[PDB]
Amino acid sequence: GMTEYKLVVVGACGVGKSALTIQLIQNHFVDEYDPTIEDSYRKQVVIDGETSLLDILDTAGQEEYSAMRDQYMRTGEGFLLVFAINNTKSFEDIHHYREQIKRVKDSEDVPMVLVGNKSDLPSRTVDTKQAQDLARSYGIPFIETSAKTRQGVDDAFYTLVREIRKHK
Ligand SMILES: CCC(=O)N1CCN2c3c(cnc4cc(-c5c(C)ccc6n[nH]cc56)c(Cl)cc34)OC[C@H]2C1
Numbered sequence: 688g689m690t691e692y693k694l695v696v697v698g699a700c701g702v703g704k705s706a707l708t709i710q711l712i713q714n715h716f717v718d719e720y721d722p723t724i725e726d727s728y729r730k731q732v733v734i735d736g737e738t739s740l741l742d743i744l745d746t747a748g749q750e751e752y753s754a755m756r757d758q759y760m761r762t763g764e765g766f767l768l769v770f771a772i773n774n775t776k777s778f779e780d781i782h783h784y785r786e787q788i789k790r791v792k793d794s795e796d797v798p799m800v801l802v803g804n805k806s807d808l809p810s811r812t813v814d815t816k817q818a819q820d821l822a823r824s825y826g827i828p829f830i831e832t833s834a835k836t837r838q839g840v841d842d843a844f845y846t847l848v849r850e851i852r853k854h855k
Pocket residue numbers: 697698699700701722723746747748749750751752753754756757760784787788791
């Protein structure tokens with residue numbers, strides 16, 4: 688039948704990993720979503736005429752290492768590294784998430800997409816050029832997104848699925 692793509696969404700607390708995922712799946716913006724809930728969500732989509740089942744792990748809880756998390760990253764086929772465009776700290780943190788994923792995959796060609804979320808906000812502290820330059824250095828696409836307006840949301844996840852396809 689149809690292909691499954693195991694996607695993992697990573698990034699600092701409060702960048703809108705949950706909000707991106709609920710927007711994608713349910714078409715609503717959640718103004719407040721339990722910061723602690725870490726769960727996988729499944730949704731069937733059409734991408735370039737191919738029917739695709741996405742299984743999306745939305746990370747949350749606490750800053751702690753677990754062999755369970757290593758297992759989710761190990762099974763994960765592709766990653767969305769999410770920061771918020773009004774939060775330089777979340778941008779500085781991208782490095783750390785990407786390093787942990789590489790730690791477990793023990794490899795360099797892992798499908799990933801850099802995502803600058805909350806693009807609906809006027810109060811930017813990370814310029815597009817900076818994020819572009821980072822994504823160039825990582826060898827991965829950059830997509831600006833807004834969970835609130837939906838701008839870029841389908842593009843982000845579809846781009847990651849195409850990145851997984853290009854690798855497989
Ligand atoms: C509002 C709360 C929130 O959103 N979070 C999401 C992120 N979470 C994390 C951090 C910092 N480092 C993290 C590292 C890993 C992680 C990766 C990426 C890969 C392999 C791993 N093995 N064990 C842990 C691993 C993960 Cl899943 C989560 C982290 O700070 C905030 C906290 C809670």
